[PDB]
Write a protein that binds this DNA or RNA. Structure first.
Ligand code: MG
Ligand code: MG
Ligand code: MG
Ligand code: MG
Ligand code: MG
Ligand code: MG
Ligand code: MG
Ligand code: MG
Ligand code: MG
Ligand code: MG
Ligand code: ZN
Lengths: 107, 100, 62, 106, 50, 131
RNA sequence: UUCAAAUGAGAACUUUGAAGACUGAAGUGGGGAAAGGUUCCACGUCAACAGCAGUUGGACGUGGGUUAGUCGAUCCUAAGA
RNA sequence: GUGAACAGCCUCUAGUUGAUAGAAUAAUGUAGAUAAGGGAAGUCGGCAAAAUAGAUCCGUAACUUCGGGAUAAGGAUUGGC
């Protein structure tokens, strides 16, 4: 099924205690696992703008909270091992605090 | 809105490591132009007319090369060593036939 | 495709380092066709290859 | 000494495409041009006028084309047109507003 | 060295012209026992020693 | 916690407190006893050249003059300008012994204040004359 | 170190773009002397080698490339032979 | 740029981003740190660490081949506007 939602991921408690050279790569992997949990799709693709948002303050300056837009869509290629995949985009907001999960109407 | 503009500018800019690409050298799309001008709230009639004129001017007409060679390729046997027509092939010039 | 040769040729033609040369990722086949500095110059002219500006070292604080 | 200098800006292309307001642009220039480090000090020194397609600035007090381009780029950024409209020089002290390159959608 | 003698350059030219694998038509000859170039030289394996 | 704070403000490396220095500066008799001392080998400068505000002994008169013509002494004097901050201040801040604190405040404002200021002025002019 | 696309049967390691860093002009930059000898560059290309991998390579196959009255040798003499 | 400075640190031009990787965070290690009160009671032996450190000002003994010792020793200061 095709669906789009906006989430907030708490990267602070997921990166708590991580070595400074590994913080941003582990943030990438935590976002992939987060999307896999919320959409049931092992295929998760992150937008390069989301990668920029993760890496904006260096390798050890990841944000505590990130506002993500996750779209479960259809894998249109006929060689796909899974029929659906997740696409994760950044949501550049005034503040990531106090935001609940919402459903975006795909129009 | 001002806070959102600050956040978007911070995400876009990377000035400490490299410069921003020049807009005079880049090109953009009329779909993005129309959506931005619609967000600003102008009238898109003149811009849409200019885009329609440009699109109707940019015409593709099938030529004889499209008719004959459009779905084909090659026309010449590919050499084993990637050589030109008059380039010697030290390894294989003594063996004329491909079976041998 | 392998555009290492085209990146080197574009740097040499434009007169900057390879760090200041931008190859359009959408015109990959067009860039791959360019084996010569003349074709590289044509690509620079039509905007497939772009020279980037220098990174700023401002002297305001100094 | 105080030889008057004339700077022209051609706003015809954005105005005819209906994304620009020459009167607002000229009023912005009048309100934001600085003389001896302060705005609102254009007494018989800087005059800005517009006739719908050309904005003319006549100045006898330290006005450059670089300053005019700086102010015009500030105005375009304020109107969120900086990503689409640029300020260029056709000849010396004669300028125009152009659009950046846009490929048709088809 | 870039500024080399003609004698050195001549030996280098001979080495370059010797540097090749076997011609393939040699393998097709009757009673051929030559199956590879046993005296092949590479610049990073065996030095020419001047 | 850190090494600088620990090795400076260790318990055995303590200096005289602001309220004690205020009580030393309050009266002229205390000023006289601190200025005129017997020669003691265990103190630097034989117990002479003693800055009361900084509660510190210098080795020589020129050293005391240089110390007085410096920002450290000025910082100490500005710190001592105010209320000496006894425990009554904290009790009153919590709302405890408020009348006692008000009585101490008015006594400081009336009696002990100007007399301490006059003693400071006389000490300063004595140091200027003798140095 | 990371993201996307491309290529490919196959991509942590190839290419382009998007990012984060580093050498910091006594350089991880630009040239030379000794030495090496084609390693330079292009096209093809993966069995072996590159202590993982590999579509990449200083690897394998086939070719192209070094233009002087003025830069050097050549001439002079040094310790010496 | 800081700074006495081709020092250390940060940056521009140019050049790299190479060295098998992933997941956890037991003991013992290697490299680096902090620590109440005491202050060499440790040890063959203060080994190792710690403490000192730039600059300005005050001041500086025995001895001496009269040149030194000497930055002797011992004190005071340092920001911003
Ligand atoms: Mg930890
Ligand atoms: Mg650095
Ligand atoms: Mg060279
Ligand atoms: Mg090569
Ligand atoms: Mg291997
Ligand atoms: Mg080869
Ligand atoms: Mg201790
Ligand atoms: Mg003992
Ligand atoms: Mg013992
Ligand atoms: Mg001594
Ligand atoms: Zn004092």
């Amino acid at each position: 099924d095709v669906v789009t939602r906006e989430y907030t991921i708490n990267l602070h408690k997921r990166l708590h205690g991580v070595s400074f050279k590994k913080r941003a790569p582990r943030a990438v992997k935590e976002i992939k696992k987060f999307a896999k949990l919320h959409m049931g799709t092992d295929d998760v693709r992150l937008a390069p703008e989301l990668n920029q948002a993760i890496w904006k303050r260096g390798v050890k300056g990841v944000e505590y909270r990130l506002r993500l837009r996750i779209s479960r869509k259809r894998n249109e290629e006929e060689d796909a091992k899974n029929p659906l995949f997740s696409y994760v985009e950044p949501v550049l907001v005034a503040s990531a605090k106090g935001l609940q999960t919402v459903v975006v109407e795909e129009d | 809105r001002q806070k959102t503009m600050i956040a978007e500018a911070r995400n876009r800019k990377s000035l400490k490591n490299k410069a921003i690409m020049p807009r005079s050298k880049l090109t953009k799309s009329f779909g993005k132009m129309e959506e931005h001008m619609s967000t600003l709230g102008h009238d898109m009639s003149a811009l849409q007319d200019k885009q329609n004129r440009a699109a109707r001017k940019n015409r593709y007409v099938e030529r004889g090369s499209d008719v004959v060679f459009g779905d084909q390729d090659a026309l010449t046997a590919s050499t084993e060593n990637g050589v030109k027509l008059r380039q010697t092939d030290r390894l294989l010039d003594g063996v004329a036939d491909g079976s041998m | 495709a392998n555009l290492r040769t085209q990146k080197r040729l574009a740097a040499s033609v434009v007169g900057v380092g390879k760090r200041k040369v931008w190859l359009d990722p959408n015109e990959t086949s067009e860039i791959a066709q360019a084996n010569s500095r003349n074709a590289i110059r044509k690509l620079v002219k039509n905007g497939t290859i772009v020279k980037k500006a220098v990174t700023v070292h401002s002297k305001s604080r100094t | 000494q105080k030889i008057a200098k004339t700077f022209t800006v051609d706003v015809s292309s954005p105005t005819e495409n209906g994304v620009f307001d020459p009167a607002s642009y000229a009023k912005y220039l009048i309100d934001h041009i600085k003389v001896e480090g302060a705005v609102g000090n254009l007494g018989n020194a800087v005059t800005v006028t517009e006739d719908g397609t050309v904005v003319t600035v006549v100045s006898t007090a330290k006005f450059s084309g670089k300053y005019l381009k700086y102010l015009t780029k500030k105005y375009l950024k304020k109107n969120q047109l900086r990503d689409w409209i640029r300020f260029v020089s056709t000849k010396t002290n004669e300028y125009r507003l152009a659009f950046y390159q846009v490929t048709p959608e088809e | 060295a870039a500024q080399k003698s003609f004698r050195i350059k001549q030996k280098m030219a001979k080495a370059k012209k010797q540097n090749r694998p076997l011609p393939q038509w040699i393998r097709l000859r009757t009673n051929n026992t030559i199956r590879y170039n046993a005296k092949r030289r590479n610049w990073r394996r065996t030095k020419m020693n001047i | 916690m850190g090494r600088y704070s620990v090795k400076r403000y260790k318990t055995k490396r303590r200096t005289r407190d602001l309220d004690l220095i205020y009580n030393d500066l309050s009266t002229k008799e205390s000023v006289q006893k601190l200025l005129n001392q017997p020669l003691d080998e265990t103190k630097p400068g034989l117990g002479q050249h003693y800055c009361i505000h900084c509660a510190k002994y210098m080795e020589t008169a020129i050293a005391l003059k240089t110390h007085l013509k410096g920002k450290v002494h000025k910082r100490r004097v500005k710190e001592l300008r105010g209320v000496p901050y006894t425990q009554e201040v904290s009790d009153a801040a919590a709302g405890y012994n408020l009348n006692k604190f008000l009585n101490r405040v008015q006594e400081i404002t009336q009696s002990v204040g100007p007399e301490k200021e006059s003693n400071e002025a006389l000490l300063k002019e004595h140091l200027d004359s003798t140095l």
